[PDB]
Amino acid sequence: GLEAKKEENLADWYSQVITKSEMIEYHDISGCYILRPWAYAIWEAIKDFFDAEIKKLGVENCYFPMFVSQSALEKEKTHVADFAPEVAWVTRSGKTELAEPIAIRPTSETVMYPAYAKWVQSHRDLPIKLNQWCNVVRWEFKHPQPFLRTREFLWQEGHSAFATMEEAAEEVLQILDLYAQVYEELLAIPVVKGRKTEKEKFAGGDYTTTIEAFISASGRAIQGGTSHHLGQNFSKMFEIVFEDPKIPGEKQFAYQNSWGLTTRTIGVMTMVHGDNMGLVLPPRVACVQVVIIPCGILSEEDKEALIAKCNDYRRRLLSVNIRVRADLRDNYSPGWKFNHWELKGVPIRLEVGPRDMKSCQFVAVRRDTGEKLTVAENEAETKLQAILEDIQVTLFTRASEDLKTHMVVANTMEDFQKILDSGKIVQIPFCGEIDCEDWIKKTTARMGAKSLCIPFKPLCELQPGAKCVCGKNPAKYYTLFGRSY
Template identity: 60%
Template structure:
């Protein structure tokens, strides 16, 4: 749903805080949190946005963590051009069909028409694999494990949403090749575990791991695994990251084959994987933790983990007391920096402490330290937690030890809160009459499912909000329920030949999670 337009009075100063409640006007809330929280700036090309340091620093931390993990797996970074010829892009028909509506084409150079249109990569399988065929000449060249950190362009015509649905976005895409299916499948799951850890350990966002259905799997792939999240304010699911086993489909199309070392002289096609995580993670994090005061940043990825603010300085404060307070604030900052804490001291003298409190709350800094005349005398600070508002009194002498511990406690509390919300909104449904009401109550649902694609299509059709008599916004995310994943952790209760799919009455085979989604 598009954010509501606010009436602007040119004679009134701009409000610093969030004016749209999260639970009442989520689209406007999301827009305000990102812009007023200094995460993002709108750009003059629709669907494109400027990532400011507040958000890009989150991506840098994710990048550093994940890059280290995949290098331990033997993956190397490379970079391939962003352009791909139409001839190459169209070589793998199933693949290009899945992306065709979103491909952006370059057709002119200056005023001259190009002889052949050139696409801007929506993903890089067709860019990279002709060269994999060139480089992989023997089974001794395997495995080949490459990753690139880059941007891609998908010219979507749906209503753009910052971080979630953008025409250009940053991501990493890993592309690997193996001799055997077993090696490929092992890596798919290993990478998926890393993606889940990014969400849960860095961003404090719970996810469910599972397989995509045949309908929802990667175009041209063998199977797709996914991490699925949940946005409590809207009751919608959201795909977090995907790890695909491409099988031998692409290697057959691009001629990537070697001699089988177990069968001398017999040519076999290699097994391939691709896997990707994008800046969508930032949007998921913001939607999960933010509140009506603004951003709430998990300490492990926050640009600043701590802000130190001098307090209690008035016209009656002596110059000696002023000097003690400012000097104390700077010493606190220095102590925490040496302890490895990302900290900033806000010593601006043209803003009141209250204004600074609101400003840093808006930006979601996990911990605020207040230091005034009384604190100087008691050699303490007041520590206010952004996520809960709880205040603690901490001794100055212990800050190098107490602050890192407190930040870890905040991180854990944020994850537990989000996990509790997610778990309470995944509902088990075995009767169709309960399906749509559960969705309307902002839940995701798990049903015993037959696994048939046409049933999946009917579920989406039958669960649109049109069935409920509610107004439908065509620019909004999917109004009908789609399959999110077949969870790895299956519920009990499916009896072969007895348990029926509530949507079509066929024999149920697996528990599948459905939901309205982004």
């Protein structure tokens, strides 16, 4: 059972949920954590959904080397300047120092695009759509947290190159909607689409799209995923050129995109849905949606009938494609199994006792609400299918309910401060300049609010002639601000 409470010390509560659900194990290297099968099954459920959707878009899977030459890093100066401090360098082979150190990729733009230049020669060679599921190392000296901010993490990174900028722009918005589907349709988490500001965008690119989720217990928001439009900045310095289809001899730089989604999705799932009895797995991503546990255990003949009914319930649920597992381990107490699968977040626990079986009834226990329903054997697969749909809805409904009440609009730095101190997120009219974004972070700390995203669909239309909260420059858009990981 858990120790620390979520409302109290959230940090120790988050560490207790990921360990006692058997998702995360620690490692003697700070910032690096172990993905145990219970956590890895969720990332595979996200992988199979995202891989199937991007393959429809013509995206193909591959794998590129993990070592970056120092010659390829300095190709894009702006891109290498923002990633320079968090690039882990290999400097020794065994015990002697390498004559030339090599870098571990925080991102493989400079690994793939040198090859993109060799492959792109004509218009027929476009569009290239490559993606890889791999690990990357970003050595941030901030104090890490599992899933939320790790120094090594798994992700997918797609790198697409187009002949025109129209198709490159429409793929960014489609990958962003796929990222939003993962959070809203699989993890039951509401997100806010938006564009990153000139300060919080991918250096070396054109613009950055992102999805931001809100964690009610901490009052902070977090970037769930990013889809970037690179334009021609990388193709200019990597010489990714192709011949014109109609005009002979004429050449044009390719328009490129890059999009990534990391294992942070799992930690956001726990921070939003996890309570004080452990984890809560959304039914769409729960590898075990229903668990059958026999209880009430005298006679050895009725015991053989109690185990047969549990098998009968498993076969009745597997027929309607419900992921059900029967925990029939005699070496464990039935009360032990209840608290075990509860910490792991199984949506429904199916209790079958000898008295309940003789009464043609079973007990379904909902993980999200804790409610107890004595369902009949005939209405098993129907109600259990109906309860599975209800848990996914309730998790999204109440998480979006906290989003609807903690995302308010303010127009003055006085309201901006008091609202932020109550653990909420604010939409403000913003000028967009970087030096004003620096002023907002320094002033709100006296910690410090950061820009989260410029919502595509803000809560209110920006009033004509309205100035930013700086008062010096006019406001260009409503921008979402708040404290973030």
